[PDB]
Amino acid sequence: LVHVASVEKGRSYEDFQKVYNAIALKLREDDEYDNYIGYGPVLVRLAWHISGTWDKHDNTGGSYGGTYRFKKEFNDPSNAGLQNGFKFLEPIHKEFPWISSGDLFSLGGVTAVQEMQGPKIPWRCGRVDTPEDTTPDNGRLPDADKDAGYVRTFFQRLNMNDREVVALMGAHALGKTHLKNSGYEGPWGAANNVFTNEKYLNLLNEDWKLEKNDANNEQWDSKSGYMMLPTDYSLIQDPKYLSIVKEYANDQDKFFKDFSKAFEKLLENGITFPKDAPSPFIFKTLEEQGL
């Protein structure tokens, strides 16, 4: 498969900045969701799950075709709870019907990170909606009950290396786990809707204990009332991942720079951009615009 990026006809930077603005204003307004965490966390989870289905071997899956809109992918067990992020974005798509699904789902992830005080993420437009038979089969997204070898191998299918994987996993300081969605329950840390290097500090400084939760799954719980997945615990069990964890724990700006590079790579996997294509856009925040 080849997937060539095609800009939505006649649209420029200013059109996409208006879709970003609409997502950012609604994030501000619907502040009460999930006990006042807001929708920022589930929107960056949605952007990673529509991108995480990519397979480098045959170019299937990934963000291009916007196939999460189809039933097979929408009802994948691994996507449980993302229906909330979808319903958030739906009035926004009615307001700007010209944007493709893949572009809207991925831009929601970018808008969430920047509005939660994260780094600027360069974003490219041009994903094109593809038919229901291009929808990937369930089962390509990663299990949580596994170790650092599983993690390294999994992320190789998206050709992410060690530094990219540890930077990406920094997103597990956002939001929380929910028993009814995944069989895991608890907050990741103290600041769950502001983007920081907190995951790495908790990984190095908390007194973590292995326990079973009410769904019979194992998770690591700390004295502070925080939890972590087995796959997050991996990052301090593997010697290569651990030196990168330490690096991000001591330097939030290095974490922001690397997360920014790896998250854009993730959202662009499987997409060929022509060089007539516009450069990646850097959107201004509401605050930068005085809105």
Which spans of this chain sit near ligand HEM (rule: CB under 6 A)?
41-42, 44-45, 48, 81, 142-144, 151, 168-169, 171-172, 174-178, 181-182, 184, 231, 263
Q: Which of 54, 123, 188, 220 is catalytic?
A: 188
172 is in an annotated binding site: yes
Breaks in the chain (C to N over 2.5 Å), named by the residue before each, are: none
Cβ closest to ligand HEM, residue 48 vs residue 96: 48
Closest residue to ligand HEM: CB criterion: 175
Shortest CB 268 distance to ligand HEM, Å: 14
Tokens of 153: 């191998």
Cβ closest to ligand HEM, residue 92 vs residue 110: 110
- Virtual CA dihedral for 228, 234, 240, 244, nearest 10 degrees? -10
Cα distances (angstroms) measured from residue 216 to each of 182, 185, 213, 219, 275: 12, 11, 5, 10, 52
CA atoms within 13 A on the CB side of 193: 17
Cα distances (angstroms) measured from residue 104 to each of 194, 210, 247: 22, 39, 33
Cβ closest to ligand HEM, residue 74 vs residue 96: 74
Cβ closest to ligand HEM, residue 39 vs residue 208: 39
Q: Which of 3, 49, 54, 123 is catalytic?
A: 49
Shortest CB 131 distance to ligand HEM, Å: 27
The residues, any chain, with a CB within 8 Å of residue 291's CB and separated by 6 or more, are: 21, 25
14: Cα separation from own chain's centroid: 24
Distance CA 68, CA 138 (A): 11
188 catalytic residue (yes or no): yes
Shortest CB 90 distance to ligand HEM, Å: 17
49 catalytic residue (yes or no): yes
Shortest CB 120 distance to ligand HEM, Å: 16
Known binding-site residues for heme b equal: 172
Known binding-site residues equal: 172
Give the active site residues: 49, 188
